[PDB]
Design an enzyme around this catalytic site. Structure first.
Site, PDB file in Angstrom:
ATOM      1  N   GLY A 185       0.777  -1.228   0.000  1.00  0.00           N
ATOM      2  CA  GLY A 185       0.000   0.000   0.000  1.00  0.00           C
ATOM      3  C   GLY A 185       0.812   1.283   0.000  1.00  0.00           C
ATOM      4  O   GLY A 185       0.218   2.373   0.046  1.00  0.00           O
ATOM      5  N   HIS A 186       2.142   1.200  -0.054  1.00  0.00           N
ATOM      6  CA  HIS A 186       2.997   2.384  -0.018  1.00  0.00           C
ATOM      7  C   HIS A 186       3.459   2.716  -1.436  1.00  0.00           C
ATOM      8  O   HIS A 186       4.101   1.887  -2.091  1.00  0.00           O
ATOM      9  CB  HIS A 186       4.208   2.158   0.892  1.00  0.00           C
ATOM     10  CG  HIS A 186       3.866   1.695   2.280  1.00  0.00           C
ATOM     11  ND1 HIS A 186       3.593   2.568   3.318  1.00  0.00           N
ATOM     12  CD2 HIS A 186       3.802   0.449   2.811  1.00  0.00           C
ATOM     13  CE1 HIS A 186       3.355   1.877   4.421  1.00  0.00           C
ATOM     14  NE2 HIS A 186       3.477   0.588   4.140  1.00  0.00           N
ATOM     15  N   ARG A 187       3.147   3.928  -1.903  1.00  0.00           N
ATOM     16  CA  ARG A 187       3.525   4.385  -3.243  1.00  0.00           C
ATOM     17  C   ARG A 187       4.642   5.415  -3.118  1.00  0.00           C
ATOM     18  O   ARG A 187       4.398   6.564  -2.724  1.00  0.00           O
ATOM     19  CB  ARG A 187       2.326   4.979  -3.984  1.00  0.00           C
ATOM     20  CG  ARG A 187       1.301   3.941  -4.452  1.00  0.00           C
ATOM     21  CD  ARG A 187       1.770   3.218  -5.702  1.00  0.00           C
ATOM     22  NE  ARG A 187       1.826   4.104  -6.863  1.00  0.00           N
ATOM     23  CZ  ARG A 187       0.871   4.218  -7.778  1.00  0.00           C
ATOM     24  NH1 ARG A 187      -0.238   3.496  -7.671  1.00  0.00           N
ATOM     25  NH2 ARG A 187       1.027   5.059  -8.804  1.00  0.00           N
TER      26      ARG A 187
END
Ligand SMILES: [Cl-]
Lengths: 210, 206, 210
Positions: C78-80
């Protein structure tokens, strides 16, 4: 609790926790393992306690071993990268494997010298020798021998520096303060907590030499 | 129970688990520690709670800390590589060590900025500063300072890249969205979930 | 109850411990996890057991997996890094984050071939493919694909060597002994516990070719 250690700051002498007869430890060396729970025995992996024909772990005196350090024993653990398969057929019980050969290969003893500082979560590979006074950085993966008073780090561990000059290392290796009588050690505390190698060497020389 | 965390996918805000007074954490930052069992307190190693004369750990808001990350405190832990022996005589109880000197030396505070992503099982060395928006790769051993929006990895950690251009980083450090009222963030979620740094920067000024 | 494994030397087949339906494992592959306590399921991190739309882990037969190996699933979690913030607003319960976008990005399946040896505490990153016969050194962090019969190590893992010549590797990939009938595997135990790839290749050819 399950933790062998009562405090994060608690360092317990190796000879007060080791039970494996193939772990040989000198006096005063300690392990501070609060953050990994187990005593020092489980730092030393795959070391059969009952066999006299396998690689041993030898640790000198006055060593500092940080939490979760690993000493890998049992050599190649039965896996031969030069055989067709690394799968250890000899050691898994399946009747289809009966004709397998034993792939176990020893690496030699792991020898840690005196006055060695091993940083937390460093891993010592099988058969490695670490010279007196060396420093292993935290999280090092030590794959080859380390010289006396050499600082190494990284994965695989590589040279960072020497702690002292070549003549200073030669002096320290000659005087071997870790082998001095108890009375000499106690009298030397102030000197050992300093950078004055030459002073201590000249002091030792007048007292120990003839 | 074996585990502080109910699920691998469970992240708990730092300010709901920290008890050590020398750990200062900003809002929303969280630790997802299922695979190492313990709460965030035990990520921070060798930090005396009762003392005020030791290195502190400071963590900004909106940080993501992966499982088993380690923050090394207590500086050199009483070992002086420049002394004849690294053995900490002063700290081991033996009557023969009575005249030993205290080898402990501070390294300075460990300071983690806002919006920092620390990968699982990274180790932060004592005294390190990590700038806002940085990314610490999994299994890094961070031995020196990391710049804002810098990505680092390896052991020792070394520069991989910067996340954005120099001017975009200047804009981000200037607008400092982490300090905005949460009502503003509510209206800005689409922008924050995008690469449109200049667009948000212009809206901020207006 | 303290430890899924009875002994440090205990290696338990993957297909006797895996419960996650998104882990697919071949026969004989084992995990020896005494020093990290948990069964193989917890080596595979952030792998939703109930979803068909996420990256899977596939492990061929005859793999050797050392203690505490880690297989990172769930892609970027979920980390961009390309968005303004890496903070996963979408996954934190807060009415101020309602309009956040889902930052989760898959990496592809993690595929581990036949006859792969994974050293203790290696970490396999999302989406990585590891070819048949590869060796992953202890404490590797594998960030890219690994070729068949390639040896890699370090963090990030990098090429060390190939185990065998190009001819020998092509021979092994063609003959695919891991797929042989059980009776052929049993008759082949001594050859598999040797370096004689070409001799085995020629024998297989005479027996299998038409
Ligand atoms: Cl590493």
């Amino acid at each position: 609790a399950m933790n062998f250690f009562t405090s994060p700051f608690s360092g317990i002498p190796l000879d007060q926790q080791v039970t494996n007869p193939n772990i040989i430890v000198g006096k005063h060396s300690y392990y501070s393992g609060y953050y990994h729970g187990h005593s020092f025995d489980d730092c030393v992996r795959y070391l059969h306690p009952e066999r006299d024909d396998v690689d041993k772990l030898v640790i000198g005196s006055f060593c500092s071993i940080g939490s979760g350090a690993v000493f890998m024993m049992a050599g190649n653990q039965g896996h031969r990268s030069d055989w067709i398969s690394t799968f250890p057929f000899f050691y898994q019980d399946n009747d289809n494997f009966a004709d397998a050969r034993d792939g176990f290969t020893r690496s030699g003893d792991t020898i840690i010298g005196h006055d060695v500082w091993i940083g937390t979560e460093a891993m010592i590979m099988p058969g490695v020798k670490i010279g007196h006074g060396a420093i292993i950085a935290s999280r090092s993966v030590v794959t080859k021998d380390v010289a006396p008073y050499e600082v190494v780090g990284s994965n695989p561990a590589k040279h960072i520096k020497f702690r002292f000059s070549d003549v200073e290392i030669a002096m320290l290796l000659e005087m071997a303060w870790w082998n001095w009588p108890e009375s000499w050690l106690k009298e030397s505390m102030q000197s050992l907590c300093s950078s004055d190698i030459e002073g201590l060497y000249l002091n030792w020389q007048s007292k120990a030499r003839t």
